[PDB]
């Protein structure tokens, strides 16, 4: 359900995707700013390294939620989480509507949150939520 854990996950992911799309700082809207900055830097690295591959992936008739659930079907780790968020941020900006400021941050962030918490809620809590991402600080 949509409990505290759900919002701890969702609020981090959705604020990052908003920042990526709008180029406005969103760290002050999350509780864990240190881990947000780690997430942001790690996604930036993934995108810089792999955007051409992402471009080929997105040129096809894709459902992003199938992609997300495929990554997490059998196991989770922080590199996987970072790569999902990075890909999905990159995707969101590419699929933004021309005639509205709709970049689908709601459905995309909720899908990522649900894919994490449907099978890995105890793992996430045991990581102390986003604290476990700090192993990727620089």
């Amino acid at each position: 359900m949509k409990d505290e854990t759900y919002y701890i996950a969702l609020n981090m992911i959705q604020n990052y995707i908003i920042e990526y799309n709008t180029n406005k700082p969103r760290k002050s809207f999350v509780i864990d700013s240190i881990s947000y900055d780690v997430l942001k830097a790690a996604c930036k690295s993934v995108i810089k390294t792999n955007y051409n591959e992402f471009d080929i992936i997105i040129s096809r008739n894709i459902d992003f939620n199938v992609i997300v659930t495929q990554v997490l079907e059998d196991k989770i780790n922080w590199g996987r989480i970072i790569t999902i968020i990075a890909f999905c941020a990159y995707y969101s900006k590419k699929v933004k509507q021309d005639t509205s400021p709709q970049y689908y941050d709601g459905i995309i962030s909720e899908a990522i949150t649900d894919a994490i918490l449907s099978k890995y809620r105890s793992w996430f809590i045991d990581q102390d939520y986003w604290n476990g991402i700090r192993i990727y600080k620089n």
Partner: peptide
């Protein structure tokens, strides 16, 4: 890449490599 390699499979490899690199 072969169309038999699922897209999530490709992103999982990126993520597991990211762990190694960092």
């Amino acid at each position: 890449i072969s169309s038999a390699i699922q897209v999530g499979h490709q992103l999982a490899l990126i993520g597991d490599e990211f762990n190694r690199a960092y």
